[PDB]
């Protein structure tokens with residue numbers, strides 16, 4: 163039984179200290195081990211100050227938002 | 236059984252939900268729970284049900300809505316009369332300039348306009364609570 | 367709407383133009399309260415035309431600033447342009463406080479005793495209806511009288 | 527500028543300008559006082575605050 | 588098959604906005620103002636409101652989209668700064684009534700008088716500057732105060748007015764107490780006449796201060 167958002171599905175970030183808070187990014191993969199605290203891996207078009215466009219988030223920090231659309235983060 | 240991160244998060248949620256309810260009770264005694272701090276004064280609840288309780292208007296809490304409405308309109312009339320009869324009609328400036336004295340009735344009445352404003356506010360607050 | 371107070375001797379349910387054949391109970395209560403209030407106002411009004419005319423004419427001023435005196439104010443229609451306007455607005459106030467001190471207990475005007483403004487009712491229903499009908503008949507007559515005194519005042523200069 | 531940015535949702539198009547599209551938007555900008563208002567009232571200019579980064583966190587504990 | 592996330596590991600999302608209570612609280616009890624929780628419905632209820640007629644199209648005529656600004660409030664600052672269509676209709680009919688009175692007032696005062704005399708564009712400023720038997724200003728102002736203190740339009744700003752817009756319950760001589768009488772048609776005629784009187788009053792006001800603007804005075 164798959165857990166978390168599907169691969170390639172857009173999710174809105176709910177981590178307040180994240181550089182992409184309330185932004186959206188494609189789900190690269192979700193780790194299926196229940197022991198992993200932050201299994202969801204999300205990649206973004208906008209890099210942060212460390213020039214990193216991907217990060218691993220918790221299961222409770224992604225809400226499966228729709229596609230961004232024209233001129234929308 | 237091993238404690239997965241989901242189980243730890245579940246314990247976090249249970250602990251927070253229980254403790255946030257417990258600390259509101261009479262068994263936590265934090266300085267932020269003193270009188271003059273966040274909680275309302277014991278016998279004088281200000282806001283309940285998202286409506287100004289009758290205790291907001293202080294000593295007027297026992298007044299009826301009709302009494303407050305009558306006082307509000309009467310004070311509005313008297314204070315507006317005083318202001319208009321002191322500023323524009325029957326000016327007192329020339330009379331007091333030549334050594335005279337103010338018409339004390341005008342001065343006393345003119346202070347009843349903001350009193351009337353707050354009186355009609357209190358009338359509405361009383362009407363909301365059904366008093 | 368017959369069997370309600372108001373139908374006594376010279377006419378029964380009087381309505382020539384209807385206005386109550388609809389049977390709206392809420393409408394009748396408001397009309398009844400209006401009819402009684404007008405009468406009650408008119409009855410004091412008819413007293414207000416008789417007394418200052420013949421005598422009374424309260425000693426004093428009624429306006430110390432304008433130097434008016436009660437004797438100066440003409441009786442009847444001409445007063446409402448001679449009584450200082452501050453007096454009329456205060457009459458509206460004294461009416462209002464009693465409009466919000468004479469609270470209504472049931473459906474139609476009540477809660478003052480015979481005219482006692484805590485007095486109690488007339489108890490015996492025969493007197494309860496007889497006095498209530500007497501108030502209505504007196505009030506209606508005064509209503510017709512005060513407009514007649516208004517017309518008489520206009521027709522013949524002063525109030526009489 | 528806003529029209530070009532909306533129609534080129536890529537960083538590659540900001541360093542290497544799509545000149546035909548750029549001049550197309552430049553010529554199309556004359557009707558801005560009407561198109562901009564029609565976008566304002568029809569919910570196509572602004573974006574709800576819950577879709578862009580509000581700012582730094584000020585609380586959590 | 589995707590496993591359902593337990594409530595322990597669910598998400599808060601951002602359904603909780605600045606216009607509503609947060610996790611658990613009650614909003615501030617404001618007196619008569621925008622109260623209660625707003626919901627987007629202005630444009631939708633605007634397409635059901637009557638007033639549209641064949642002079643301009645036949646559907647809901649609103650270029651500039653002033654109706655929709657309430658629905659946008661949620662996108663903008665998430666605050667109902669712009670009124671709902673219910674408040675807009677209340678303003679519609681209030682302006683219409685006031686104009687239908689005011690236009691014939693302008694006409695009558697230029698041809699009628701009572702026992703002070705001063706133009707029409709300076710009649711009020713004169714009456715507010717020379718009281719001799721002019722308690723009529725007091726009576727008119729207290730009537731206005733009582734009327735729109737009693738008939739203050741509830742919570743029309745956020746579209747939650749229980750009273751139908753413009754329905755003050757003033758139908759003394761049973762003019763349209765009929766079950767429908769096409770009450771839509773009577774209301775439409777009222778709105779058309781109110782708009783016409785608004786245009787007339789605007790024409791007169793703009794002409795008196797811009798000479799030769801509107802044909803005839």
Ligand SMILES: CC(=O)O[C@H]1CC(C)(C)C(=C=C/C(C)=C/C=C/C=C/C=C(C)/C=C2C=C(/C=C/[C@@]34O[C@]3(C)C[C@@H](O)CC4(C)C)C(=O)O/2)[C@](C)(O)C1
Pocket residue numbers: 516517518519520521759760761
């Ligand atoms: C379906 C239906 O019917 O619904 C209706 C039913 C209801 C509820 C009953 C109803 C109502 C009530 C109504 C109409 C009230 C009517 C009011 C009438 C007012 C009367 C007045 C002003 C009296 C006068 C007296 C005057 C005197 C004038 C003179 O002194 C003058 C100057 C000069 C003198 O030389 C000559 C003079 C001649 C002596 C004057 O000029 O005026 C309502 C609300 O309308 C709805």
